[PDB]
Amino acid sequence: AVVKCKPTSPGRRHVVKVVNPELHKGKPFAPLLEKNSKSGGRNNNGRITTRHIGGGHKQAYRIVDFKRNKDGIPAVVERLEYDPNRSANIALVLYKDGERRYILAPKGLKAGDQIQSGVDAAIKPGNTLPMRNIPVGSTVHNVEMKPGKGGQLARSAGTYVQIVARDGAYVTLRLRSGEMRKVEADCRATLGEVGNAEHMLRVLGKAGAARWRGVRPTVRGTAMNPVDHPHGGGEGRNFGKHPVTPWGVQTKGKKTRSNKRTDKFIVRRRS
Amino acid sequence: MKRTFQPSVLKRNRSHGFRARMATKNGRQVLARRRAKGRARLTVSK
RNA sequence: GCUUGAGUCUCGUAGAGGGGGGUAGAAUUCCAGGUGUAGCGGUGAAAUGCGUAGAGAUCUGGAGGAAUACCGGUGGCGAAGGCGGCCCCCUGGACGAAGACUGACGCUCAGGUGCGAAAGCGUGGGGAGCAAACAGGAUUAGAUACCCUGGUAGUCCACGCC
RNA sequence: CGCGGGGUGGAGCAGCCUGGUAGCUCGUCGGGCUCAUAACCCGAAGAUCGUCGGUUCAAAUCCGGCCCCCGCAACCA
RNA sequence: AGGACCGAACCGACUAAUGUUGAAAAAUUAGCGGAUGACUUGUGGCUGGGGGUGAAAGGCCAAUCAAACCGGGAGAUAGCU
RNA sequence: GCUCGCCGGAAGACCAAGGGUUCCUGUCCAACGUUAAUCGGGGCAGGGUGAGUCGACCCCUAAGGCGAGGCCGAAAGGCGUAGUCGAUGGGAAACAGGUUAAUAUUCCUGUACUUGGUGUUACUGCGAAGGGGGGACGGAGAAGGCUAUGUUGGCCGGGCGACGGUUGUCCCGGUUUAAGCGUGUAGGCUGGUUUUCCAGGCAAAUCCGGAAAAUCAAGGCUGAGGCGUGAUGACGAGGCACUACGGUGCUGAAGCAACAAAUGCCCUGCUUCCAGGAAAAGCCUCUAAGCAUCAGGUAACAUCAAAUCGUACCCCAAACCGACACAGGUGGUCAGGUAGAGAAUACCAAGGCGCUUGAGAGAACUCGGGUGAAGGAACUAGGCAAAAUGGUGCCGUAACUUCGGGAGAAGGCACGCUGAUAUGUAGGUGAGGUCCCUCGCGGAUGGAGCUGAAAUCAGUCGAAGAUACCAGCUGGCUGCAACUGUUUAUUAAAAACACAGCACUGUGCAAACACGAAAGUGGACGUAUACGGUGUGACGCCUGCCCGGUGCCGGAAGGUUAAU
RNA sequence: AAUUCCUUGUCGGGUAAGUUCCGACCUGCACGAAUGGCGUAAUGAUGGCCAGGCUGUCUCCACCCGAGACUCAGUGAAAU
RNA sequence: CUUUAAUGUUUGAUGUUCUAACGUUGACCCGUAAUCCGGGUUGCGGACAGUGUCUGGUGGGUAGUUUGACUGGGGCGGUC
């Protein structure tokens, strides 16, 4: 769990590690492991399309299963791997037929537990079944926007979408952002909230901690000159320009949302 | 101190080398301008 | 050594005793919608406020949180703090009957340890209602208040302090 | 010094830029109220516009000068 | 265990002196800061001119940068020497 | 040639990069060389680079590039699929000795090894762009086992000595040997074997995964080094011999032991932590398409082949980059002795140097240093600069604190040499012998030899024992920024920037946002505990009032209102 | 006060003597709450001030050792 | 003509429904040893979305430019 570090050195004083002893400390299951090269936040043109990110410790992409296409095959869980690519820990499930796949781990999950996909399985946690079969009000995660798409809503650690009501092929959802949103009933959803809810409690501690997370320094506009940023300038920390992104779009209060075609699925907006 | 020229024959040919010039239309236009000027060393080469 | 103190055993009895996990109904507010039209809300009296951008009143549906009506009883349980819907799970103490058993094993207790309303604080949730702070309106000679219309922390949950 | 602003009953403010009857609140005095004072209620008096001149039929209102007050400026080597 | 301590290589450049037609178009000598990390370095890639990149100084982009260099408009224009 | 001095974790010795003949031999001195010059990295001739095993080429990919079609774009062209390139990584194989004026792991001598081809013989189901396995990977730390390497002893040869002693506890030198082949050790990993079944491995599979039993418990893999062989060979201090007297020919001693010991090797190990740690081929295996008398594979044996390019020389510099024979800059590898914690520092070995003007004199003045009476910041903008402190063990140690610090606080003491304790101890190492054995690179007991701290006591020398070089000045009050870091290359290193943390706000995924007139990429192979922007800047205590102005958000009744 | 003009504000402390320093007073020209306010251990080639030790920094220079300066021979510049 | 009464009819604006245009950075097949692209089947949307022309708004994101003269130096003030 959460474990505050001893202040033997500065930059250690404030560190708070999140130990998770119930977790496999050896190497991951190799067959499901493809490489992931750093972008450095730079696209095809080589320009730096997204600032900040770049650098940081190397990591390989585990192939996590989402479609959960296998139906009616019971699946014994094996061990909880660490997945550096994500926030949530990933279980190494073993289906009866011998094929193995990684999957995001729900809170109530333990090693050796039985879990099944498909329209039959059960309302036990970790089962992935279409939402039309799911009781109203129950907590689910890894919800799909469209059948077979894989999984979209609720993947981050500790997150969970809460089904609210059903109507026809549509079914309302209270997304974690508090936004009510309709979906197709046939989309799959896995039962239970995602595990590792303590992810947020980590406080990293020193500067360098973010560095190997892949993050680089965020320079304030006020520090930059008037040519580099819409803010900046002045002899001694003046300001007074209404706050804006480096590209002159208004920040802080400006609405940027406009897809038109997705508007029909939303009900309540976030607040 | 360290001077601005730190030669490397590989990097040199990859950059200003003949084939590099033959890639883009602009490169080929360079070679056109150099033959027109009657210059002996068209491009640096092995 | 003895059994009248103290204690254990057997069948029971009552109880908002405690912790955990569910669940219901009434109501308030909020949202969408229908009907419908000029006031509503409030007060000692008013005003601010809300309202022809269609309020309030009224009906249907929905979402949320909190507390749990009558039963309720100078009734009950708990060491005290305290504990009120229903239901399961885990559990403490008391009391009664008839005996049986052990044989003074008891009483109090500085220092010590633990538990300890409300408010408050720390991390992370949640947020209906109520409401310090704050704001406006009145009252007044003044009114940093009492009264009114709003309203944030907080109140609620988990875990730590105090 | 340069510019701008102001001086009005006992206090604070209007009215001046739109030269033709100087107001508002408080204070003061007077009578009521009350055992008495305060509050409250009813009344009344109170300036003749910093100041010396000009202008005009008429100047607190326009003009200039003088005496204070107030604000901005008083810079570049 | 540590963006821990002292301290060579290694990287950096704080103070002083010399040098300033130098030994050198920013160095030498003496001391100095970091030195298992947000470290340092080799090879090889990628980002380009109103663009790049920037732990931000308007710093760096081949000894040149409040807008590179090279050729072209071009014998720009100059009430000024 | 003799002596002197300097470097020696380099100012030595190999390489890459880069140069491109500077290497060597003869000859020449105009120019070049900061002088002269018989000399040269200069001129002029001639010579010189030998590979199946080193490197490249070659096979395989990384980042990344080019990209049939394709998608998109006034044209140019952009993106990118299949593909195809791209080492800085992965992929078969060799050492020792001798030799040239200049090359050598390339020549010669000796002894090896690999991958193919072809054939012969004996066997046998072989076969993918497909499947699976393997290759295949972080950091930090801890030792243990070894070796390089060194020291001492013994052995062997030589010496007995310019001025006292020195045939002995004396002095000087030498005491080296690989790869390969055999042995499988310390040590690491792992339960193995057989049978039976399958919702899996875009098809199948006798392999892989998985599930059942049965059965024995070891078996198997990896593995430094040692010990043998290689090697009755080479090498070898020196002698024997001439010699164009530069060198060649001839011969040849001993060639062991103990100890110390790595940063190298076992260790692509083990333990541990989190930041969670390339790909692909070669390799092994499984079948499909197929073909089965074939072909094809396996083993043995023989035999052929291993092409082509680099190879000289410099390579922390006089040959590269700095206009220079320029106090500069530049990656990897080796790394001996004494003292030392040490790759620091000092003095040395191997080895290479004395930096291309010197010779005098011994003014001022400047530079770089040494020393100083008495006073001790009075100097000065300012203790700038100098001076001083400085090690190892032990004692002792404040406010304050986020309870880790502060702290090496401050301030002290001891320190050499000799003897004894102990004719060198504790410790480490481990012989001989002996004991036992599933018998070898075994296990016990055993203590020889060697190595070897630290301490107490006594004595002794100097003015001074951390004697050299090396090697903190300390304390107090206070501003600012929490901290480590980063910053104006070439006058600013900071209070500036970043920072963990906090808050606001945006974004529901074909996300926001950015680059691109598009396609498309990034964001992210992420999903609101996420991601973007903005501001503040750890931690503690906190964050008050104003919605007039400006901006954003929300609402539409009414007024105004574009093309149409 | 990194903010304070008048200002060497006023008082205290420090020194024989202190326009700077430390502690307060508040008359804040013209502090002030995330363009953050107020404290803060530890950290600093950071700013200010005091003390001990130490010294040629200084009173006040003196001598010495090397490299140049000077003389000879050779070569042989520059800015203007 | 007041008022609009019902019907018919032309056009306009809403609301609900459908699918064939169109979208699909949904699944599955073939080209095809291929996460591109096209084709095909199907689900999902569905006349919106999105693109063109015209059009209003916003727009220092970016560009081109302007920003006087006299003056007892210029600026400020004043003046033309």
Describe the structure.
It is classed as ribosome. Keywords: translation, decoding, recoding, selenocysteine, ribosome. The entry is titled "Structure of the 70S ribosome with Sec-tRNASec in the classical pre-translocation state (C)". Chain A is 50S ribosomal protein L2. The structure is cut from a larger assembly and holds chains A (271 residues) and B (46 residues). Chain A is mostly beta strands. Chain A is built from one helix and 14 strands, in the order ββββββββββββββα. Chain A has three domains: 1-113, OB fold (Dihydrolipoamide Acetyltransferase, E2P) (Beta Barrel), CATH 2.40.50; 117-194, no CATH class; 195-271, Ribosomal protein L2, domain 3. Helix content of chain A is 2%, strand content 22%. The longest helix of chain A has 5 residues, at 207-211. With 46 residues, chain B is mainly alpha-helical. Chain B has a single domain (1-46), classed as Helix Hairpins (Orthogonal Bundle). The radius of gyration of chain B is 13 Å and the shape is elongated. Classes of the chains: A mainly beta (271), B mainly alpha (46). The chains hardly touch. Chain A binds six RNA strands through strand 13 and helix 1.
- Output the strand order for the largest sheet of chain A: 9-14-10-11-12-13
Secondary-structure class of chain A = mainly beta
CATH topology term of the largest domain in chain A: OB fold (Dihydrolipoamide Acetyltransferase, E2P)
Name the CATH superfamily classification of the largest domain in chain A.
Nucleic acid-binding proteins
Distance between the termini of chain B: 30 Å
Q: SSE string of chain B, helix = H, strand = E? A: HHH
CATH hierarchy, class of chain B? Mainly Alpha
Order of helices and strands of chain A: EEEEEEEEEEEEEEH
**What is the structural class of chain B?**
mainly alpha
The CATH architecture of chain B can be given as Orthogonal Bundle
Please report the distance between the alpha carbons of the first and last residues of chain A.
Answer: 32 Å
Biggest β-sheet of chain A, characterized? 6 strands, antiparallel
Quaternary state reads part of a larger assembly
Count of helical segments of chain B? 3
Regarding CATH, which class of the largest domain in chain A?
Answer: Mainly Beta
- Please, how many helices of chain A? 1
Can you count the beta strands of chain A?
A: 14
GO molecular function (chain B): structural constituent of ribosome
GO biological process, one term (chain B): cytoplasmic translation
Pfam families (chain B): Ribosomal_L34
Keywords (chain B): Ribonucleoprotein, Ribosomal protein
